[PDB]
Symmetry: C4
Subunit: 346 residues, 4 copies
């Protein structure tokens, strides 16, 4: 173990030989790559490199692999110093993980000439001209199916609607089959959320045709027929960021609903007792003021009834303040999750 | 007093012998633990450790016990350097206090085989299976007592309700007695907020039975019977964080209510004078426009009356702006208290 | 000019003799205070002080008086190093100004035994027991004058009110005269905002008595009689911070009112044209929809009228969004001014 | 290549001669400007300058022109060190770009005695007295044209209005011609937004006079006549910052409108199905509840209809929460753009 002296443009660093040996792939590790940088007269190695960066590089050998960037060094300057010292794609990967950019995954392609083209056209719209044609045709078909849903339920009408709906269902099933049979890995296809959305978009038409050519459940089927709005999430990137935000924030949504429940029970109980002694008062139960407290705490302020007494108006003043306080507390965490996933794109 | 030279991997530090002596428990303090690190030829001590950390360590001896972490050193790296220099569990405790993590308290257990099990089951639900059974049974009993309270006050009914209410009161009193008689220290039991909540949850049933088997006060007793919602704070951690937030923020709540009072008196006075010259106007007093200014400043915007003149609509425009300004000022302090107590958990 | 070497615990600094001379009051400046710190064998001065602090201290001599604190040095540690080097109360004052704590003013006292006591009791309530008695009596008299103002304007009444009002005016004029005749400097008395508030609080009673014992102007006098709420700003510290916030933020309030004006003209013009072709529509002019756009943009959402057409409901949707955007823009600057003046107290 | 030693007040830096040569204009680059700073006995250059700044200066030569300011150095101190080392107006410009102050543009003037005065008076109001007179006359003429627009559409009137409107149009066309014929570069005149606003402000009067002296299109012309509000953006600086904010934030406005569309379709579909089984319910279609969901999600809370069932009130509670969440997400990005462009002025 012999102490070795390294000069980084004036800033001298001294370490024992054993510390450098631990890693051989490094410029310092191999005795013939660093041998050139050595100077015989002063028994020192001279590197005209950046002084702050070397202190971090030296601690990598001392810590057996820990890598950090000094808060006073830009990421790019540190990255080029790491490349110069030849720490390795593994140390560089650790540094990248510390920065917080682990999204290096690259999704595969089908292993054939024909299949790759079919998957590329449907999955990748940025490639060709026909790909953008398929994208615009798909968005237009989704939009006219939404229009058909709402116009179906108008009362002037309640057949062209069945023909337009069956053409939309033919297009949905066609692109689902083409997407399925041209996918590199079938094992991944029943784990994407969007393919499940496409399956739920085409199911209730087929079960209605089946049981109709073979009341509350029919209401359930009619309600399920609204999940065709979420087929726009394949073509919209803000909606995918909204889904990531809502998944990451499930504890805060439960706290929002729980705090609003506690406040609704409390202020409904309080308002009824004050108004119970006035005949003009509209509140007749505690279940009754539940609506009044929801719209007063949220500030929609419809007003199921207007308080008629003095204690009822003091309770209403406190309800209007307490809702602002209650709602404003778990919402900055959800908007921080949104800002994170949204500016992650840059 | 002889100057002693310490080399931290190249970065040389010089101090007098007296400074090291002040603390003997340290590696530098005792003359035989540091003696090995000494090198005779250069009359220097060599440590292959992190250079930024040592400057902070040296100032600990110079300052007679002050310990700080340099803004450019991660907490973990500084913590391991502190352990290496053997400063002590006292210096380490001072460093931890500076970081802001003083919650190291560990609450005791009953000194017996039987008592410890009873306290553990009721106090600690994460232990066993019966503990989670007691937790789920307790939350269900609290929820059906809330449902019984509101259904009691419905007008179609006004006995099964007395039987369900007396079963709920039997369960509440049973677990309160079991919690009390199995507690390591009785002196702490009348200082927890939750045990006071359980006592107030079971009192008015017993005083109603007493004076009923022996009007405004009866109204007070009926209102008190709503504090059974706060028995959910033992099973909910967001509600405990909400109570800590509301205790820490009592000056800001008083400022919110005071600013709203000042604005209500001011804008009620202003609107009445403008509408006094119009017969169609609904405002008849200044006490009268108090409600109109509360719901206009908070934005619930019910509208006790609609202003009928031009000056009354200019005053209403200013009221709607001034409420947003007034309310928005003390609320970021309350949401910062919430974020602090909420992310303290991680 | 001879180079002089200073060692700060290992970290060597070299400067010419002329640089140290520029300031003589410093420990380095005088040749007999620093002479002791000098060591003859190494021709160096040794100081066991903090290394980062000295670099800032040296630049003070080089820059002819500039003083800064390194971002990596706590204010207290730098302050004690400044005191050790004896830079002076002037350099220390410059450092304090850089930190941003210029509020060192100390307001005087009357130059007599009798006057000082009278000024101290009225101006300073934290001194004695009678001082807190005067404070509580003053707040109670202000509160009953507010109650008399609103009860005067009730319609069941419209004399005990004149007697209570004249007792309140006697107390206000009494403490104003006692405050005036016991003030160290009369030149400052007609520049405080609170003494002007007290004068405007007692004026309209005296001019009403004068012209009544000697219609729109009477309305003006009645409106002026509401400035007795602002007499609570002497006893409330949140109201003084609110006044400082509102003075510092006058450009942002003008921008808020200007943006709301622009939006009201724009959306009133747009809604009327869409509803002009429908007889059922309530909008009849552009002046008419001014109220509807104010309450839709602010979200009070009273609704002067409900849009009856499809274009009118598209315009109403855009009005409801645009008001949130317009109002939310200049308000974070006002809440930053509030947070600054409010946490300035600590 | 010979190593050269530079001492910055004790802090020694060593570099090879070739690195200094790369830039000759620098004090170090030329062999006769730096020759004076050299000291023969120690073979070192001595500079009593700031030690942190030099490390950044040295990396400029090593990196072939990269310039950065250390996070621990104030901008002014670094700027004066850059000037001392004579790096150049090019290196200084790179440093300024890194700081983020690229607005150094200086707009020209007409090349004649007469033209320069005419352009200066109209373009620059801060120069003279007549310039402020032209500014105040212009703002007054714009304000009375807005008043004439709204009073035209009152129903008591529907000629003095044509005379006032034609005087306003004469003034607008006069200052547009004077601004045009006195402009240094005509190529820039059809690219300013404000000159396009002035042209659209004077067009529909002339096309109405032309086709009237030669129904939906007439409605379009009447609507276009509202763009005279935007002629105030020349005299208002908050409105110019609002236009810059709205241009920089076009993706966030599209996301706001898209999220509100998705929520309106979803909650309209949900509320109708719950209320379809109740005759008292007002919702009759899904197109019908579109208004109800817009005003519930935005909190204006007019209420097209009031839900009459229990499932309809659970859906209404969720709509009132979801609108707050949906709207609150893309709005902090727009207020950050506002704060940036607004505090850019200082
Ligand atoms: K609202
Ligand atoms: K509202
Ligand atoms: K309303």
């Amino acid at each position: 173990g012999e102490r070795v002296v390294i000069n980084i443009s004036g800033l001298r660093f001294e370490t024992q030989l054993k510390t450098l040996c631990q890693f051989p792939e490094t410029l310092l590790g191999d005795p013939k790559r660093r041998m050139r940088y050595f100077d015989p007269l002063r028994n020192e190695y001279f590197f005209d490199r950046n002084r702050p960066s070397f202190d971090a590089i030296l601690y990598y050998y001392q810590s057996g692999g820990r890598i950090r960037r000094p808060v006073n060094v830009p990421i790019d300057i540190f990255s080029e110093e790491i490349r110069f010292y030849q720490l390795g794609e593994e140390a560089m990967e650790k540094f990248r993980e510390d920065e917080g950019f682990l999204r290096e995954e690259e999704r595969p392609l089908p292993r054939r000439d024909f299949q790759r083209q079919v998957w590329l056209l449907f999955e990748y719209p940025e490639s060709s001209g026909p790909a953008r044609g398929i994208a615009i045709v798909s968005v237009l078909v989704i939009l006219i199916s939404i229009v058909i849903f709402c116009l179906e339920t108008l009362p002037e009408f309640r057949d062209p609607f069945f023909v337009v709906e069956t053409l939309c269902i033919i297009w949905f099933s066609f692109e689902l089959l083409v997407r399925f049979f041209a996918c590199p890995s079938k094992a991944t296809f029943s784990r994407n959320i969007m393919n499940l959305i496409d399956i739920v978009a085409i199911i209730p038409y087929f079960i209605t045709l089946g049981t109709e050519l073979a009341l509350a459940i029919l209401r359930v089927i009619r309600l399920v027929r609204v999940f065709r709005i979420f087929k726009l999430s394949r073509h919209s990137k803000g909606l995918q960021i909204l889904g990531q935000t809502l998944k990451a924030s499930m504890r805060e949504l439960g706290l929002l609903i729980f705090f609003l429940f506690i406040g609704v029970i409390l202020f409904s109980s309080a308002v009824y007792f004050a108004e119970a002694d006035d005949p003009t008062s509209g509140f007749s139960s505690i279940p009754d003021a539940f609506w009044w407290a929801v719209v007063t705490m949220t500030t929609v302020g419809y007003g199921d009834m207007h308080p008629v007494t003095i204690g009822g108006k003091i309770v209403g003043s406190l309800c209007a303040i307490a809702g602002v306080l209650t709602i404003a507390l778990p919402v900055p965490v959800i908007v921080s999750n949104f800002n994170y996933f949204y500016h992650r794109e840059t």
